[PDB]
Symmetry: C4
Subunit: 365 residues, 4 copies
Amino acid sequence: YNAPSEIKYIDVVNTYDLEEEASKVVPHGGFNYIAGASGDEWTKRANDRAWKHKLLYPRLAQDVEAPDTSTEILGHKIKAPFIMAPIGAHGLAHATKEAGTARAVSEFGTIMSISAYSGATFEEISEGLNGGPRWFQIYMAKDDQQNRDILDEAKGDGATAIILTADSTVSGNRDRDVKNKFVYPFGMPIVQRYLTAEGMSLNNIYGASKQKISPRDIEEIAAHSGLPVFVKGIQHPEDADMAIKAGASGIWVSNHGARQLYEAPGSFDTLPAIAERVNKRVPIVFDSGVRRGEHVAKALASGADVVALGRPVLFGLALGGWQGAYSVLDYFQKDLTRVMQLTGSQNVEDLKGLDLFDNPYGYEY
Amino acid sequence: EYNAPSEIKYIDVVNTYDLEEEASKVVPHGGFNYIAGASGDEWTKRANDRAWKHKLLYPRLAQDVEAPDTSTEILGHKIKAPFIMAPIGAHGLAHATKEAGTARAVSEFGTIMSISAYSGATFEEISEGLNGGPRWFQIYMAKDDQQNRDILDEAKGDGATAIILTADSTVSGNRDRDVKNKFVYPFGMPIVTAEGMSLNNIYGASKQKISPRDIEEIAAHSGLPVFVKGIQHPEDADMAIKAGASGIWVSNHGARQLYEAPGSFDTLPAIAERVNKRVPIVFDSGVRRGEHVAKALASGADVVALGRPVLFGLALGGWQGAYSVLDYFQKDLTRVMQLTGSQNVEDLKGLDLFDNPYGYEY
Amino acid sequence: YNAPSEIKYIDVVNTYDLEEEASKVVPHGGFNYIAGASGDEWTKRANDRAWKHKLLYPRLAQDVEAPDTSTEILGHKIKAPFIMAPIGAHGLAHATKEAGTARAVSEFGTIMSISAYSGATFEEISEGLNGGPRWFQIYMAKDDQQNRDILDEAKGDGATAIILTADSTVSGNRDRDVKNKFVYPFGMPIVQRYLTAEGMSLNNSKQKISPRDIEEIAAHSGLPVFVKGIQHPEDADMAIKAGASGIWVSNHGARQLYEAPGSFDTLPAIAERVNKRVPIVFDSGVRRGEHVAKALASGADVVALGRPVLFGLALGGWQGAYSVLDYFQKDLTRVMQLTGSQNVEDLKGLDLFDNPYGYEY
Amino acid sequence: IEYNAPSEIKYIDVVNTYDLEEEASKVVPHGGFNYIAGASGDEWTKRANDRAWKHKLLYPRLAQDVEAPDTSTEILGHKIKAPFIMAPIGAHGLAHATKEAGTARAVSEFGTIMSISAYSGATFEEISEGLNGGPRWFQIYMAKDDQQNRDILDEAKGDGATAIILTADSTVSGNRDRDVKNKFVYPFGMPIVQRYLTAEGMSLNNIYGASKQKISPRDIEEIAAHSGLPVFVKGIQHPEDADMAIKAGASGIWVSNHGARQLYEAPGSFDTLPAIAERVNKRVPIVFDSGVRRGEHVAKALASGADVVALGRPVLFGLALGGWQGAYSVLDYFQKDLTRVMQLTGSQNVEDLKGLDLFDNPYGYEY
Ligand SMILES: Cc1cc2c(cc1C)N(C[C@H](O)[C@H](O)[C@H](O)COP(=O)(O)O)c1[nH]c(=O)[nH]c(=O)c1N2
Ligand SMILES: Cc1cc2c(cc1C)N(C[C@H](O)[C@H](O)[C@H](O)COP(=O)(O)O)c1[nH]c(=O)[nH]c(=O)c1N2
Ligand SMILES: Cc1cc2c(cc1C)N(C[C@H](O)[C@H](O)[C@H](O)COP(=O)(O)O)c1[nH]c(=O)[nH]c(=O)c1N2
Ligand SMILES: Cc1cc2c(cc1C)N(C[C@H](O)[C@H](O)[C@H](O)COP(=O)(O)O)c1[nH]c(=O)[nH]c(=O)c1N2
């Protein structure tokens, strides 16, 4: 597996163009694993086109200058209201793998989410973070003791929150991966105890993780870890009520980048109903489709506290390693700064109160 | 000479849409387009497909679900999954084993075979393929009353446990591909010569002046439950039940009949609300994915019926190819059940759907 | 101007395909004059896509067989609920011009509408009609005596209604014709007196038409008057108050005001306002039997056919044009059977399914 | 900074304004052409500006007793030949060698108002020569220094400005991908704002960056008080800003999204107009811009609450193709296009336009 190895900053004009650029340096199978989604990818398109449903207003004479992008979540002060989404197997994108992404995220000044399906060990990632804050995303074992062990190792590494990804009890129908017969070209050291991953398909990896996740799992992870728990993959408001009742300390609105259930809504369309149900009882992280500063703003305006970034950071990693990934984070901060100035937002809380224009015509207008 | 493919093999289905173009490589041009095509410029066939994006499924989490059960029961038949085979004539356009091949797939899978009155096979040939599997017979009514009595008696003696009255084909749809290819039927219809006849003249020999009395007459004569097939307007569901139907079969004939009509799935909720659980509902016209099976049940259907994708599987692999399509739908549905929080088929019928007012382009 | 000249029936699978086929035989300028519309033709596309806003239901066990397409309008018995729209310069499509269309229309058994801008004389058209019914479409002159004279000649020819086309007081912005520098290759003998049109552009007649003109035409001719080009219901009220005997809903095939609605979308509001006081003719975008049915279900009494008939005339002279009329009758017969309509009055009562998603569904 | 704008002067036959874009691309240098034509992001909001016109459709009306429609109107005491004015646009020398004096001559001779951008590549004296006494409004991009604003406003008023336009939607630049990809810089100076920067060799983000970011309602008040001229506030898309501007002493509201050159993933400008017009409630005049390309658009804007529209890109493309005569051709095209529309809609005069029923099209562009 010939992963890219260039380390360089990149001049990001927009994040969309990074996809085709990365396609020229990432091996075909791996690239399509990263870029692809379920079915014919209509719901991935829906994640993107959802942003045109609610439109931002420019606002004038707002007495605003030098907008402050910084915010705080679960005690962590971060440079902008976005974090790194949990993504396994960064080694598909770049030889420096999760340690590269970790270096970008910590240097930038936000929170790194570590996937249980990382191709790097806790020690390797921690070397890249150099003290930076991190949250750990568990894919649950069937065996309780193994979940206890993974959680203890995560916390001992320094995790300050646990993310339970519950929308992948089985694999999505990822036609690119089926057609390419994709299999991992390396191991997953954190979950190996219950599988190695090298040569396995993702459907069999998700297959070893727990299918019968219930609200008791949320309660049990919360009690065992003593850390705030996010429940990730929520698209229906009832699950936010369920998660909060079961002791969750945050809601993570996501459709897994459209890699899971097909013929489902664009994730952004689901956010307002979820935020209304949550009603600020706990923090909300939003993901699945964020590509612009305007998207960050619209998410916050619609009830998110922060967003999580995925594919664009991974494409940045492919093209330039840690410096490429950092270039993408920096882009988002600068992009957001512009949008804050033009929308009349002095600070992150102002973003959360913006009026949005309803566009009933959709993408073709 | 019509020379259909004859190879029997399993196929690895990634999705059923790709089966269309794959099947086009092995089926004679004329026959293929007869199967694939629809009325006018096929806008309503596209509508059947795009309607699925009007109501979107939610993923649901921590639902305490594992190993979802796809089994269900309809009019006392226990079936492996909530889909049956739609009645389609002339399977011989797809594969040399014709309706017997589809029958074997359906029977071995474990669902119900619907036999078209316009099958290219006899009841005896189809029965060999079914090897005892359940079957329903779909009638295209004759003008002559005794002929209807005779066909129904033969169907029932063959083992039919329900009758399907297809009433949306009193004349043929405007099927441009068949006109432009100058296609005509290459073999007979022995249950009802058909060979060398256009479909429009075939439908011409059947009864045009179908009335509610016909539903009453078929039910009384056969002593079997009768489904009325082709329904798109809720008043017809009411009429059919009042006339003695034991089931409603929501369909636009795969968009092969009236043009510039709705996508079938968009018609389902108003029909199910009108039926008000009085009789079972079968839904068809455009089902291609497990997501579609789930959305139809969530919208008031009890089962769906499959058509073109199974024929395309038959073309590619005979009974084994058709079986592969049925298996694909069962596994596809299983995934969807797991991700939506559905442990069983009754759970599918209760799912919330997300309304998408933006339609296909979003 | 090398117009098509051959005469033969044609196979019509659908009318949309006639446009491309006609383009291969009609001279470029004249073809594009017939086919084109204002601006970038968005409103011509809207005329077409409007049919997907309201969708037909198949209906079952309706006790229907051998549907009857026939109807009557102002006492004329016609074979199907469609007439020929008034279109000038049929010579652009075929050497036999309006006499060819007239033969098709009379042989079929409907009403011929004669444009004041016809390339043929009344006598030439009359020999094609062989006694068949005709209505005369006037484009008003500024001079009152010229209007009197034209109406007298039309009535003398046998017109049994007058159609006042009032949506062309100035020309639409027809980019194809501007880009092609289109000019008529022949004269317009009926309106000669006030212009010869050979060498003239269409944009080069009365602009200040008022309701009084409707009154004066009705009073002078003693014939029923249709007011043609209506898209707003207030104009239906105005026209009926002014003595009109019919309302002709139309946007001139999208050749007039640009960035306006598709004609079918305007029909229900106009039919509501008319409230059955007078008959309604609908045009602009009819291409299928389904469209005929939908127009009737939405308040029209008949529709008028235009471009597809002209494309048929290009392809086959009167027999070509006849094939198109026959196509529409057969197409409607299928639709009637499948929708549960025994007769034309049943079409007028059909439920339609609302499609809020539009063309891409 | 090599830059070779076209120089030929000729009338042009305008069939429609859309076609002028491709035609101008043949003769305007690449960077400057794409600076004029382009917009933010992937230009979805520029497309929205254009497709918004299909949301509300015109009715033809019959037997209206209308002939020879009169396009003349009046705004803040200026009698103009048609209900459109020239939008403020800097650096006209990117389009044609004759620069802002070329456009000024066309606008003046046609008989409407010239809006002069603070970022003009021409001095007041050079523009005034082109105007030959014609009416002018001055568009300020504010300095941070109060005295420099007073000086600019004084010079503008001395030159003959009869209104001041505060463009407040560009406190920082939009994300203009074409200009980033092309590394666009201005090839000449901006004499009116040089005092706070020159612009030659500078990127627009750094010129906007020198202008005032922290614009507040007090700036509107101070401009109005200092100049003693009516002040428009330009770039409004949200009705609250119309309330704000009037409360602060504005004499007019200029609805605009800057040609989609500023905030991305925002509504098409025409879609915002009715809510603004409802809030304004005829307290002050409304200028509308961003996407006007046809007489139908002028009509629809007036029917939806605007008093006049402002023209931008199509006039610059005309300038590129023919200098002042090319620009004149574009203005004339608009007057004739509007006249046709007025005849067919039953509109005898500009006030009738403002009263037109519109057909609501909930299907949008694809219908
Ligand atoms: C390649 C790749 C791999 C993974 C993911 C995504 C992608 C793209 N996602 C989902 C991820 O956290 C996030 O929800 C999406 O990346 C957001 O969608 P976009 O990146 O904005 O398109 C994911 N989520 C998770 O909780 N654990 C994981 O290991 C992975 N793996
Ligand atoms: C080739 C072919 C032939 C037939 C049909 C369909 C097709 C595709 N259909 C309609 C069929 O029962 C069912 O309604 C459609 O197949 C459903 O549409 P899809 O297959 O999902 O597109 C049909 N229906 C019926 O009742 N008797 C018949 O003989 C046939 N024949
Ligand atoms: C080439 C051409 C020429 C004319 C027209 C149309 C066309 C296409 N139309 C309008 C005509 O009566 C009718 O309203 C349209 O043809 C209907 O649109 P479709 O033909 O269905 O697209 C027209 N109308 C009229 O009253 N007098 C005329 O002379 C003409 N001329
Ligand atoms: C090349 C160019 C340059 C500028 C502008 C636009 C364009 C296209 N615009 C905005 C302008 O006044 C107006 O809002 C838009 O031109 C209207 O959009 P359309 O031209 O119809 O697309 C602008 N606005 C302003 O107040 N001062 C300026 O200097 C400029 N500069």
